[PDB]
Design a protein around this ligand. Sequence first.
Ligand SMILES: CN(CCC(N)=O)Cc1ccccc1Br
Ligand SMILES: CN(CCC(N)=O)Cc1ccccc1Br
Ligand SMILES: CN(CCC(N)=O)Cc1ccccc1Br
Lengths: 237, 300
Amino acid sequence: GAMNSSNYAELFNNDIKLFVDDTNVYRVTVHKTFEGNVATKAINGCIFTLNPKTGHLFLKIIHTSVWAGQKRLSQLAKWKTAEEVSALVRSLPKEEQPKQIIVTRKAMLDPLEVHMLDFPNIAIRPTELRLPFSAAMSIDKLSDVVMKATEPQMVLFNIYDDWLDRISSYTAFSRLTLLLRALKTNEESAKMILLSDPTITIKSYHLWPSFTDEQWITIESQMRDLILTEYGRKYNV
Amino acid sequence: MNTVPFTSAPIEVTIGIDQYSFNVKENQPFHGIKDIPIGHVHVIHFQHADNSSMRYGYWFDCRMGNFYIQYDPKDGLYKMMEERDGAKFENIVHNFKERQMMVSYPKIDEDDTWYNLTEFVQMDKIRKIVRKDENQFSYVDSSMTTVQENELSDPAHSLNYTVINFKSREAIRPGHEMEDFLDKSYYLNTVMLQGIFKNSSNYFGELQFAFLNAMFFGNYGSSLQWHAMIELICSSATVPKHMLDKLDEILYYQIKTLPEQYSDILLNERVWNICLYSSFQKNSLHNTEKIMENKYPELL
Ligand SMILES: CN(CCC(N)=O)Cc1ccccc1Br
Ligand SMILES: CN(CCC(N)=O)Cc1ccccc1Br
Ligand SMILES: CN(CCC(N)=O)Cc1ccccc1Br
């Protein structure tokens, strides 16, 4: 059934699983037409498919051409997501296929279940967790490869960089979700925290800066403060 | 007109014949039911006064044999049986008719209710759903489960309705996942109609039989089947126009006949609101929508 606070450590056991987030698949800018009506212009999107144990992020870039001549795009986007996830699973060796796929929004359950009828042993599950994966497009290198794509494309990143050499996947996932929650709540502030110190750089294959253990503690503290801050600014508390 | 004579009525019981119900007291001089219209299937059903649990009954067609009911004191129920000796059967039915020991099927010459509820129901198809080939009549009761319910236990005592499952490989063509899930026409027209039922009459027959088992026996699996067969049509964008008009009539008479006080348990709020107000056929069931809105506006 639904993943929640009580069964949280299941994410980090040795049963292969993937999260799938569809919140950046169909993206638009809204603007005024010469006649003063409103129209949308789609921009490139992405499916966010993540193995929380290993950090394996399979980023399927959704090029705007997949929407051409199509109706009801918000509904199509859920089925296109399910189609691409299904294709990904079928492309993996049997022993790499997930035993569970956790969708971050319940409207993905039926589209994915229907696309995965050939895999009766893969469990499709919702979650009661409010995960901040929509903020994936605030990571500069991910946003860059999405917006530069001229055709459909799959790109691979470890979203944990090399952290698992030093911390567990439980801890790496906690760090990731803190970082993403911060970027979602105040992107500018979050990015100033992460990048202000010019002596700490981002390695060319990494997504995040090369913080020492001690620096991560400071950064993690600063991100908590930011989130608490905005919570006050927002609610006047 | 045909007759279902009774050997006796040793235990107090409510007897039902199609949409009608009457009471018989323990050891009352009751010897059965006469003037039963030839040309239709019929159902004779029972609820004991001392254990209203287990409604049970028998689907039969008087053209297929001479049938009578005798209580069995070992198995504790009224059993339908067949007398092959035609001479003997007629000789006995005549004695009962002369002594006026039978109640009369009350068909009133303005009423087409039973025809309209059983138009497509055929005894040959009932006998394939209810497997017990040594008898010409078919036993059904409250507790019998469907082949699909047994998939989600005794196979011999099951209701073999046609399995409908919207999230199944049979319902969904590879490469048309979204199309086939959102518009079930492929599944209705090619898989079910052309492939399994062969024609819409056999489809409507199973739908009607399912409704009646749900209504008369409180058979939950039959209720699920009835609603699934409605939902498959309502969720199809392409349905033969004659099928829609006929479905509207079928459902109208089913809703008209339902006990008002059972509406809470025999009608699925989700299916009906989807069918009348969201589905492709939301504007195609005018008679059904009007009776539903005037009789069960709570549900909607
Ligand atoms: C290193 N390899 C990917 C990088 C690449 N492009 O070949 C491991 C890996 C597998 C699958 C997903 C992410 C990741 Br990270
Ligand atoms: C009791 N009766 C049998 C009489 C006999 N054979 O000696 C059962 C029954 C059979 C046939 C017709 C009506 C009915 Br009621
Ligand atoms: C006669 N009553 C309802 C008939 C009606 N007016 O609808 C119960 C009944 C049904 C069938 C046979 C005998 C008897 Br008694």
